Amino acid sequence: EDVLAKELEDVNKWGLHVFRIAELSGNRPLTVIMHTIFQERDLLKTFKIPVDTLITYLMTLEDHYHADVAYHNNIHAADVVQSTHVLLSTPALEAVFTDLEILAAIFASAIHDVDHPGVSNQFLINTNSELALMYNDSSVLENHHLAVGFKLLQEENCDIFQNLTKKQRQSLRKMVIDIVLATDMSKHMNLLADLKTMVETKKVTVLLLDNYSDRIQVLQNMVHCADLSNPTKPLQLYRQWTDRIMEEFFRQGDRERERGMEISPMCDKHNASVEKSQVGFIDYIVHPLWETWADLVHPDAQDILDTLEDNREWYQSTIP
Amino acid sequence: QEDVLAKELEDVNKWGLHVFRIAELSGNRPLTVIMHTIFQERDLLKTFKIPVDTLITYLMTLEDHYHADVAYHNNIHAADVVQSTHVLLSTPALEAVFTDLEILAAIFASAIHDVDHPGVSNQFLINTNSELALMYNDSSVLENHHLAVGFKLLQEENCDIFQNLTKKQRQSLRKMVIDIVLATDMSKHMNLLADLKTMVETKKVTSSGVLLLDNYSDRIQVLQNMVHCADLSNPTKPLQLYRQWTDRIMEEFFRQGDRERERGMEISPMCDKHNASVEKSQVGFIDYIVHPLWETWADLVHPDAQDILDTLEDNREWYQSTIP
Ligand SMILES: COc1cc2c(cc1OC)[C@H](Cc1c[nH]c3ccccc13)N(C=O)CC2
Numbered sequence: 001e002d003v004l005a006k007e008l009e010d011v012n013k014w015g016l017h018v019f020r021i022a023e024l025s026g027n028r029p030l031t032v033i034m035h036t037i038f039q040e041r042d043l044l045k046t047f048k049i050p051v052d053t054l055i056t057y058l059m060t061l062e063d064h065y066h067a068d069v070a071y072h073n074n075i076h077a078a079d080v081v082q083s084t085h086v087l088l089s090t091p092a093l094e095a096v097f098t099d100l101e102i103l104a105a106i107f108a109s110a111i112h113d114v115d116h117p118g119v120s121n122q123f124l125i126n127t128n129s130e131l132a133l134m135y136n137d138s139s140v141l142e143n144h145h146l147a148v149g150f151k152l153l154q155e156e157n158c159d160i161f162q163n164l165t166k167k168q169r170q171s172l173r174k175m176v177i178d179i180v181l182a183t184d185m186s187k188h189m190n191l192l193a194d195l196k197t198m199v200e201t202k203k204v205t206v207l208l209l210d211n212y213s214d215r216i217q218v219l220q221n222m223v224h225c226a227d228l229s230n231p232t233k234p235l236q237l238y239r240q241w242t243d244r245i246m247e248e249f250f251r252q253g254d255r256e257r258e259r260g261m262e263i264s265p266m267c268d269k270h271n272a273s274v275e276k277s278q279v280g281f282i283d284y285i286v287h288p289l290w291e292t293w294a295d296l297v298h299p300d301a302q303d304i305l306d307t308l309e310d311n312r313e314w315y316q317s318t319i320p
Numbered sequence: 321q322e323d324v325l326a327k328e329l330e331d332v333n334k335w336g337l338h339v340f341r342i343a344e345l346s347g348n349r350p351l352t353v354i355m356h357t358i359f360q361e362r363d364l365l366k367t368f369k370i371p372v373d374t375l376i377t378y379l380m381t382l383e384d385h386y387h388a389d390v391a392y393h394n395n396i397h398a399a400d401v402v403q404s405t406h407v408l409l410s411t412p413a414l415e416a417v418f419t420d421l422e423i424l425a426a427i428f429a430s431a432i433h434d435v436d437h438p439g440v441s442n443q444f445l446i447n448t449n450s451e452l453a454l455m456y457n458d459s460s461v462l463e464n465h466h467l468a469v470g471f472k473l474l475q476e477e478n479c480d481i482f483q484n485l486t487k488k489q490r491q492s493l494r495k496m497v498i499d500i501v502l503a504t505d506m507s508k509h510m511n512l513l514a515d516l517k518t519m520v521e522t523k524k525v526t527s528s529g530v531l532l533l534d535n536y537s538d539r540i541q542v543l544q545n546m547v548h549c550a551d552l553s554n555p556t557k558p559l560q561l562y563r564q565w566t567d568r569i570m571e572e573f574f575r576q577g578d579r580e581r582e583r584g585m586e587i588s589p590m591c592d593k594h595n596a597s598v599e600k601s602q603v604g605f606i607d608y609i610v611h612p613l614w615e616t617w618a619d620l621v622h623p624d625a626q627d628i629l630d631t632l633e634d635n636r637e638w639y640q641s642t643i644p
């Protein structure tokens with residue numbers, strides 16, 4: 001409680017003790033961290049959001065993250081939110097984003113995985129799930145996360161946007177949808193190609209982004225970087241995230257094995273190589289993304305990129 | 321009554337089928353009887369081992385999920401798009417181009433393409449914060465819903481008309497049907513037309529004179545545009561059919577506009593019954609949407625569609641003549 005507030009002073013820092021915060025807050029890290037960031041950024045006054053409404057929505061949203069899902073739960077959501085919060089403060093992006101864009105990114109991060117069942121889009125498609133039937137096999141989870149996140153605003157005393165105009169609401173809604181849909185990993189390559197294009201064409205004084213298309217692309221990549229930030233965190237945090245994602249993957253592979261389905265990559269507990277998978281994850285996905293991001297905001301991401309490279313070196317050394 | 325119905329269904333291969341008569345003669349089952357006729361005409365029940373009782377049960381359930389109280393986006397419209405697609409599939413320039421599975425996908429897509437349509441636009445559903453727009457994140461709201469319903473109904477009792485397809489066949493058909501129905505969203509029309517024009521300008525024809533389509537992207541693009549053209553085919557039909565479609569779309573538009581007016585919203589284009597110009601709206605629809613599309617389709621299959629294009633141009637002249 002007093003240690004809880006002590007831990008929350010590192011809210012602007014990469015490496016926040018999120019698991020400690022989750023424990024101290026009574027499994028409410030999403031709520032407390034979101035509340036802290038909103039205060040820190042003066043968003044409640046800027047958007048005239050009533051404190052009780054905020055808390056009420058946050059707790060309801062946090063309740064819709066599954067507590068029996070090892071990785072895609074409220075701790076992950078809190079982590080992405082806080083990570084986004086830090087990336088938004090990158091010096092190279094000063095004066096780029098409007099206040100509504102900042103609120104959109106943070107809100108998008110909070111709801112980006114809500115009601116995740118702990119199985120992949122491909123699993124949902126292959127089991128002819130109700131979700132895949134509703135969403136026609138296209139960004140199935142991500143469409144559902146958005147629909148739940150927005151539907152919860154309609155609950156009693158949960159409309160945190162009640163004092164925004166209809167136009168501001170309509171603009172925020174579009175931005176949030178665009179950002180969350182971009183967290184679908186099947187979109188990673190296209191996103192990264194666009195981020196690369198922007199880096200080669202970049203104008204700076206600090207980054208100068210005149211049109212909406214470029215600005216949303218940056219926000220999309222930012223939240224995607226935040227979603228894929230575990231290997232860039234201090235190793236003690238990273239290893240906990242690896243344990244959780246492997247537990248979730250293995251539970252999926254157990255359901256697949258029981259059903260007689262082909263077991264998804266990295267999901268077979270009888271045949272896994274956790275460490276080799278992490279090095280390959282970093283080499284082919286996480287480092288290309290964060291290296292391109294670091295170029296965009298050169299040199300503000302340096303410490304983050306240094307940690308990622310230290311962690312890749314350590315995981316490689318655990319392979320005999 | 322059944323004799324006359326049968327007589328009328330002999331015209332199923334013809335542009336200008338008496339679809340409103342068939343709707344009455346069949347007891348408001350035009351979608352069921354026209355789909356059944358086309359499946360028999362194309363031997364699809366035999367090819368895909370579809371039990372006839374399963375086909376009829378699914379068709380009647382699908383048809384039930386069109387709204388009988390919506391003036392335009394109802395089972396008659398669905399039946400019309402199905403039949404129009406069936407005629408377009410038979411164009412000489414496409415002989416032996418598409419597989420039986422692709423033919424099945426295009427016809428099935430047409431049948432389900434507007435199922436459970438509430439008679440209001442995507443923009444109306446978004447602006448009124450509807451449950452549908454909340455479910456689908458404001459993106460192809462209606463068309464995603466039409467797909468979800470059309471596929472879900474296959475799971476009802478004795479409704480799985482695809483029960484004897486292989487797994488790979490079902491997977492391929494599902495993807496093609498989704499790609500086709502999503503392309504009926506009018507917000508995709510400009511890009512879709514732009515693409516079709518690019519294909520026309522670079523088209524390859526085989527030694528028999530038919531279209532050469534040797535990759536999924538080009539194949540699905542043709543089927544997408546084919547169904548879109550069928551969806552936008554009312555002004556290409558004989559005038560007595562076209563005028564009835566215009567009467568119906570304007571009733572539906574006016575009812576949406578009444579809802580908008582009551583709610584204080586800006587009335588959508590063509591939806592104000594106090595400030596409507598039905599004739600000018602048809603000429604604009606043809607000039608900026610329907611003729612650009614059909615002239616490009618006619619170019620793709622040249623000269624197969626020349627009579628259809630000639631009718632479109634005659635109907636544009638007629639509507640224009642009513643203005644002065
Ligand atoms: C801590 O480590 C991880 C964390 C996460 C993943 C993988 C990790 O480690 C291999 C995967 C990423 C992913 C999606 N498709 C893929 C295909 C190949 C490789 C990775 C992925 N995630 C979700 O499912 C995000 C979190």
Ligand SMILES: COc1cc2c(cc1OC)[C@H](Cc1c[nH]c3ccccc13)N(C=O)CC2
Pocket residue numbers: 441506554555565566569589590601602605
């Ligand atoms: C018979 O006449 C019609 C039939 C149809 C439409 C318009 C017609 O006549 C103006 C509209 C086309 C349309 C969609 N958004 C638009 C925006 C502007 C103009 C047209 C459209 N449809 C559905 O909504 C399809 C059927």
Ligand SMILES: [Mg+2]
Pocket residue numbers: 112113141183184
């Ligand atoms: Mg996700």
Ligand SMILES: [Mg+2]
Pocket residue numbers: 383384385386387388
């Ligand atoms: Mg009905």
Ligand SMILES: [Mg+2]
Pocket residue numbers: 433434462504505
């Ligand atoms: Mg439609």
Ligand SMILES: [Zn+2]
Pocket residue numbers: 076080112113183227
């Ligand atoms: Zn996530």
Ligand SMILES: [Zn+2]
Pocket residue numbers: 397401433434504551
């Ligand atoms: Zn239609």
